[PDB]
Scaffold this active site. Sequence first.
Site, PDB file in Angstrom:
ATOM      1  N   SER A   1       0.825  -1.202   0.000  1.00 53.13           N
ATOM      2  CA  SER A   1       0.000   0.000   0.000  1.00 53.13           C
ATOM      3  C   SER A   1       0.860   1.254   0.000  1.00 53.13           C
ATOM      4  CB  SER A   1      -0.938   0.006   1.199  1.00 53.13           C
ATOM      5  OG  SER A   1      -0.190  -0.016   2.395  1.00 53.13           O
ATOM      6  N   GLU A   2       1.960   1.246   0.750  1.00 53.01           N
ATOM      7  CA  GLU A   2       2.946   2.303   0.645  1.00 53.01           C
ATOM      8  C   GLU A   2       4.339   1.740   0.876  1.00 53.01           C
ATOM      9  OE1 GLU A   2       0.073   2.932   2.550  1.00 53.01           O
ATOM     10  OE2 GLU A   2      -0.778   4.474   1.258  1.00 53.01           O
ATOM     11  N   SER A   3       5.300   2.371   0.214  1.00 53.89           N
ATOM     12  CA  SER A   3       6.714   2.304   0.532  1.00 53.89           C
ATOM     13  C   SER A   3       7.156   3.713   0.907  1.00 53.89           C
ATOM     14  CB  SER A   3       7.528   1.816  -0.673  1.00 53.89           C
ATOM     15  OG  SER A   3       7.263   0.460  -0.986  1.00 53.89           O
TER      16      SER A   3
END
Lengths: 279, 279
Positions: free
Chosen positions: A45-47
């Site tokens: 979903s995020e880095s």
Amino acid sequence: HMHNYVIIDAFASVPLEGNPVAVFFDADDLPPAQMQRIAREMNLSESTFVLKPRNGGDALIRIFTPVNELPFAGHPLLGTAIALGAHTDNHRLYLETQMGTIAFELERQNGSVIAASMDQPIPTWTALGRDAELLKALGISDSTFPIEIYHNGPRHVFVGLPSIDALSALHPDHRALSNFHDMAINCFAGAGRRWRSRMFSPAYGVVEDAATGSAAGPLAIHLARHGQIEFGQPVEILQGVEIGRPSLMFAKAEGRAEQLTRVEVSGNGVTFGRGTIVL
Amino acid sequence: HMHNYVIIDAFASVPLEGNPVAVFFDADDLPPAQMQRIAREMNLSESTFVLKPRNGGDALIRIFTPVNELPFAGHPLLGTAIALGAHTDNHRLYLETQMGTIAFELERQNGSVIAASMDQPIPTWTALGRDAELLKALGISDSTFPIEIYHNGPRHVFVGLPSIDALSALHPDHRALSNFHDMAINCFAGAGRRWRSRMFSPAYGVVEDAATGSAAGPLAIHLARHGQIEFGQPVEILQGVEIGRPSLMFAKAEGRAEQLTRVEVSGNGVTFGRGTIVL
Ligand SMILES: Nc1ccc(-c2cccc(O)c2)cc1C(=O)O
Ligand SMILES: Nc1ccc(-c2cccc(O)c2)cc1C(=O)O
């Protein structure tokens, strides 16, 4: 040449619970286009990417979904603070973001950061004004509390259910929810200190999210405005149970609706994995 | 206790090209429910798990999307063979799957496996019979070659475009494509030995796939049946260009349509990253 990373399950103390974020260290040599490609490769979903500070903080954090950069995000920043705690002795961490510097308090046991608390941007809010459409998409007739949309970067709508069992019974029409652009739909139920939530967001690319940290502060404000808790009272928000990613978020909003002075969100985090990439 | 993994970009020689797969080694201690949770945590199109063989092969591979186990998949198995080449000296690798044992030829330079070739299941095929609906969803009036659906585990439909530029110009209605269940839509264009492809599949959870290895064998059969190549002629299929994940697949189908004797797909692969998980 190479970069180390860790995968943190945010809002969890047990791996495979909570909501994952990949955190990349020593990222100053990566242009943003390359950060975006790496976030796409990872498909989490995020880095996030840890950079040298530019305005007196400890580090500058850049946050990417697989598709775009975000100016703010809840669980990714919590996870980043917990990951960076492995590389500092500081009690507090000041992380620069596109929306300014956010203060984190790090909680350790024997040198390992097990949890953190963060200030959040103070949200704004208004009535959504699309109640019948949203309720139909969710498959229910009415909300308990007013259907209001909060903005703190992302936008979060809150729809209240009359019991935890009613919340678990929801089976939304995700096609219908996709007509709600640039927002997430947070459904909640509970009482007193203890609340349950489920979040659905076609706009943000998630059928159902495990732990929506940027919604936790707004929910505390919503519950206080609507008389279920007081301002300054911490709440526990358990999200992701139905999808098998239980996530515990704590939140508190200080002040009053017309003059909020602080919005705090906290949670545990745990390392799922550690690695190195070849660029 | 812990597991090592690698991330392989399959059908690429350069990291951040091709199509990623995570490969987990020494996975015999993981029950399948835990493998599924790990694949969900990683959120890559597939994670694979390397197990001791049960039927005389070198290893048994289990293949998971974030949601379900697959009996066969193209790029995940190619990537697995390339990853395992780091841990054997064998020229050929026999990987057991739910659909039987698949033979891989490993290609090395100075001990590093840079590419591999695999046998594939021999597909079956028929007309799709939904041409007007599919063409409308893709935004075009007609296909070049017959619109046929192939089965080799997954199902792959092929729609031909009159030029590479026309293929790149496609902007499908993904909502309309979602009415095509349990299949992927592969659009192609080219001539002679060199073809371009784009794959779209709501059913398989991908807006547009970088490298659909299980479609490469079927495409070679389709091109030979429809007179564009001969059986036994290798083709080069370049996929993923428009989405910035160029992927080169090679394919050959031996025999004739009524008696196919072998379907081979090959490609390069490269390590993007290496790590360890805590369970
Ligand atoms: N997982 C997320 C996906 C999108 C956003 C977001 C969307 C629009 C504007 C913006 O500032 C942030 C936030 C999160 C989060 O975790 O808070
Ligand atoms: N990426 C994929 C997603 C789903 C499948 C698949 C779907 C149904 C049955 C089945 O046997 C396989 C294959 C792939 C692949 O890479 O080949």
